[PDB]
């Protein structure tokens, strides 16, 4: 159990961290094309997914 | 004619050990500085600004102060085919690519805004390469919807 | 010269402390005056006229008597790009924003109307923020559906 | 005159925080730099170069890239008796000493390639001492077999 | 004018990345520089000198060598009311307070000496502050007893 519980906890933590990393990377990759526009007009992404 | 597009004091140099290696340009109330260029902007007020990186598009952007927003370049979402003005000389737009004569653009010629025939920025060039017998520029422009698309030729040469 | 001769007496200063602190304007059958101006209208008939509060839009509006509906400013819903007439000087509408040259406009100038070259009011100002060489204006205008879009720049200094 | 040979100057200043401490030469397709100076080479290509030290003769040597091996000074093993050229006037090589007019050369004027009437470098000065009559200089010169003979006057100071 | 007669090779600048940052002056056989200026004095002989701190009076003071004492500024204690000569321009002394015209003095001007008509320094400037047309400036002077009184205006901003 000590081995199995530790393995399960490690797998869950790694999975959660990886999912958060991919979500943040996706948000950056979907916002920066719209974010660094000089006037910063970002209606479309915020309306279709509410990323911000 | 060509000299009426170089009286733009709103561009700013980047100093590294007293040398020039790049230019930081202000467009539409936002200051853009090429990421690969190391150094410090000569202007103190713009140098003190904290910029947010953008690795994919290869430039860092910052929000200029309110008092500086008035005197700033104007971007354009339309890029009609043909002639364009640049500080080094004429540039020509064909099939979605900017091209310049041979030997134009080198070490320290990045961050230069490619002005239009009207007199307002349409894109910012980060580097250029010469493949075969033609020279093309890696450059970031602005789409009609404002997605800041970047076009980069294959095997692009920095600056 | 060309911008100052467009003079209309429909605007009325607000009197308190025995000094001018703002202007109230009759447009399309409604009398408009900002929150920040205190006092009585110079015209006694409108001074005694009750007003309805609209705090979130920052303008008291009052229903003009039917007799005086004949002589009033004409509202406009289209805002073509470019310069417009004003009491002081040309006001540039660019990028969906009204801007005035350096220094023009200060305290006590709030409530003045921005008209067009045709000679009819296109918007009314409530305050101005200095962006540097060019000064932006906090102003409310009229849409094609009459939804009364209000444009308030960031941290605008209130006139 | 001996000054028309300043056109042959391909030496590169070394700057330390904007202060020049010496000059690095490119002789015979080989970059020579004084060890006692500190800073960075004038151009980036030699700045990024890797140098191998030589403490006994007090200088760093590096191999120039293949692109510019031809664009360099060309050396000479023989030094006939008499006066040669320099950026600071004629300097006389007499019986084993390269001596200059008194009061010429100080701190920071080091690593300087000496020249003769043929426009060919025969030695590189590093420092010198001011005798009552004239000033003798520590110098790295060459001989017929090419073993890099070095001379330092007694009680010599670095430059 | 009196600017041409204020020439003095005694004063030296303190650079910071090749820009004017401070001013160190040799007076009465003693080198003075402010606390708040960072960098290295341009003169190598004084840069080699080791200086001691004085936090309260905002002065690093060092003893010049014997040969340096031959030519240096002369100090006096008496300060009659009226106008005095400064490198930027004329200043005036009233009610025990030095002051300068509007906008005369900014960053990098600290450490400059103040001169009188007969050609001798009476005080060393450290900073200033402005409320009206006059601009009272922080300055350290000398009394008849030789106690180095330091007059300072309220919330004086550092120069």
Swiss-Prot record, chain A:
Interacts with spike glycoprotein E1. Processing of the precursor of protein E3/E2 into E2 and E3 results in a heterodimer of the spike glycoproteins E2 and E1. Spike at virion surface are constituted of a trimer of E2-E1 heterodimers. Interacts with 6K protein. Interacts with host LDLRAD3 (via domain LDL-receptor class A 1); this interaction mediates viral entry to the host cell. 2 adjacent E2-E1 heterodimers in the trimeric spike interact with host LDLRAD3. This is Spike glycoprotein E2. It is found in: Virion membrane; Host cell membrane. The chain crosses the membrane at residues 2-22. A lipid is attached at residues 30, 50-51 (S-palmitoyl cysteine). It is a single-pass type I membrane protein. The chain holds residues 701 to 752 of 1254 of the full protein. Plays a role in viral attachment to target host cell, by binding to the cell receptor LDLRAD3. Synthesized as a p62 precursor which is processed by furin at the cell membrane just before virion budding, giving rise to E2-E1 heterodimer. The p62-E1 heterodimer is stable, whereas E2-E1 is unstable and dissociate at low pH. p62 is processed at the last step, presumably to avoid E1 fusion activation before its final export to cell surface. Residues 23-52 are cytoplasmic. Palmitoylated via thioester bonds. These palmitoylations may induce disruption of the C-terminus transmembrane. This would result in the reorientation of E2 C-terminus from lumenal to cytoplasmic side. N-glycosylated. The lineage of its organism: Viruses, Riboviria, Orthornavirae, Kitrinoviricota, Alsuviricetes.
């Amino acid at each position: 159990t000590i081995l199995g519980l530790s393995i399960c906890a490690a797998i869950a933590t790694v999975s959660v961290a990886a999912s958060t990393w991919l979500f943040c990377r996706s948000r950056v990759a979907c916002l920066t094309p719209y974010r660094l526009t000089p006037n910063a007009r970002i209606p479309f992404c915020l309306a279709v997914l509410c990323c911000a | 004619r060509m000299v009426m597009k170089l009286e733009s004091d709103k561009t700013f140099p980047i100093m590294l050990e007293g040398k020039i290696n790049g230019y930081a340009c202000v467009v539409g109330g936002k200051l853009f500085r090429p990421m690969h260029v190391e150094g410090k902007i000569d202007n103190d007020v713009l140098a003190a600004l904290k910029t947010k990186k953008a690795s994919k598009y290869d430039l860092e952007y910052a929000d200029v102060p309110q008092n500086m927003r008035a005197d700033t370049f104007k971007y354009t979402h339309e890029k009609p085919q043909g002639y364009y003005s640049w500080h080094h000389g004429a540039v020509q737009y064909e099939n979605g690519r900017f091209t310049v004569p041979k030997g134009v653009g080198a070490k320290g010629d990045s961050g230069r805004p490619i002005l239009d025939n009207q007199g307002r920025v349409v894109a910012i060039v980060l580097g250029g390469v010469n493949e075969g017998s033609r020279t093309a520029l890696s450059v970031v422009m602005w789409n009609e919807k404002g997605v800041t698309v970047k076009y980069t030729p294959e095997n692009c040469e920095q600056w």
